[PDB]
Amino acid sequence: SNADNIVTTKSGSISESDFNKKLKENYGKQNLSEMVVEKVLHDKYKVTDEEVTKQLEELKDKMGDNFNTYMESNGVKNEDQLKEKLKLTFAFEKAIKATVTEKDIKDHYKPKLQVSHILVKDEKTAKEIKEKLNSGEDFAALAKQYSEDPGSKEKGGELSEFGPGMMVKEFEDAAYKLEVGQLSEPVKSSFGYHIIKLTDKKELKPYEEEKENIRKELEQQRIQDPQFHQQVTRDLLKNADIKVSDKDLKDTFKELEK
Amino acid sequence: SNADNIVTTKSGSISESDFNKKLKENYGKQNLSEMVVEKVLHDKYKVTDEEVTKQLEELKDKMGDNFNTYMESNGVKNEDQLKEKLKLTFAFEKAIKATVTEKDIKDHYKPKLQVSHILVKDEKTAKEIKEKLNSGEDFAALAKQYSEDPGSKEKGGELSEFGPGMMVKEFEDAAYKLEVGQLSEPVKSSFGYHIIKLTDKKELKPYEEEKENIRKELEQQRIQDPQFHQQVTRDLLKNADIKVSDKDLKDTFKELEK
């Protein structure tokens, strides 16, 4: 019964009752949180047995003899339990992929830009250089004279072609406001102050032939960002209309406010 | 009853039965381990209410208004619960202090040594210097000529007086084998190769007037070393003659083997 010991020691025994009460007091909330999140992910994003058995076989071949040792190091004791971990992980990813909207994909359908840039440490030098450019001095020559970027000062300030999300927002936004041959205003970044010149604006395949690739890149970009793992968790729980009836676990979703 | 919900969501409800079963499966062992360790520490090393109430008041004054906010950030909701944390921490320290034996205190009752040293990068240069010393060349002069130690090459290789446990074992052991005026053999350390000369061997107060200080230093030295927190935990559990009767929690003290 509840008053019967579950362990004996030379320091005394512990009843199943005291054990169960202590357990709910120190893990009740963490366990309810996990349980509800797992119940919502399997509800909103179903994963099939094929997608999980497949991922498992690809892990068995890679692990080999080191598999039976790895499975026991994750609170898992059966292959059915490891599938549950793999399945929960795959549902979580489907949840993140679902946060990618048309607008997010359109904001990234922009042509790759071929630009040159001059990097100086202070804003004073940047305005001075921007004035020599207005006077008609050669951008490639000024980049050889003042740029601090070792990988572009010898090559007229040329940078490898780039596209959306590949550069710092301040640098990117300034570059897409330019027309071929136009110069930017001094742009501040962590390395100092930049002057951007657009030399070429690469062609762009139709939208309907790029949305697939754009979507996959955003999807993978969010899967690595743990900022989205916290965002997706938080949103699934708020949209779950959670109501705890157990008095001891009432303030489990306490910090879900935001 | 057990079939009654403890939470409702738009993704479905969870019964108290499923909740309790899932809880024991994902925290049963971690909770049993903690519970037994806490039961052994309060059994072998009693802490009084004065030692805990006192430590608490010293924490209230330091925390001030930031206290009511700190207490809620440690899974604690009452002052009686915070005392339990403080008490467990004080019992754990008493456990570590108890690992200090007479032999450990005697091995540290040694006189402080005043030595000079020459530091070179290779063993070849060390033997060459050790030979110039045998020939009768001045140690202070050779330290000015070859030592790599910026803080002692200009001062004849002099080092501040030191005692047991303050230096690397290889350096310390070599220094206590010397008599005033004797030179060591080349000693290897992380910085290279050393040649030690003992210039003075400071006086030492009687053993009975030093064991108190020696004991306190070893006690505090082990309280910071987490190598002892794992050692004391492991030993208290092995000396507890633990026997788990619950089948689901049988392999909780599985990895206690050593």
From Swiss-Prot, chains A, B:
Assigned keywords, A-Z: Cell membrane, Isomerase, Lipoprotein, Membrane, Palmitate, Rotamase, Signal
EC number(s) on file: 5.2.1.8
Membrane topology according to the record: Lipid-anchor
Gene Ontology MF terms: peptidyl-prolyl cis-trans isomerase activity
Subcellular location: Cell membrane
PROSITE patterns hit by this protein: PPIC_PPIASE_1, PPIC_PPIASE_2, PROKAR_LIPOPROTEIN
Pfam family, one: Rotamase_3
Keyword Membrane: yes
InterPro entries listed in its UniProt record: Foldase_PrsA, PPIase_dom_sf, PPIase_PpiC, PPIase_PpiC_CS, PrsA_foldase, Trigger_fact/SurA_dom_sf
One BP term from GO: protein folding
Reactions mediated catalytically: [protein]-peptidylproline (omega=180) = [protein]-peptidylproline (omega=0)
Family: Belongs to the PrsA family.
Protein name: Foldase protein PrsA 4
Organism: Bacillus cereus (strain ATCC 14579 / DSM 31 / CCUG 7414 / JCM 2152 / NBRC 15305 / NCIMB 9373 / NCTC 2599 / NRRL B-3711)
The encoding gene: prsA4
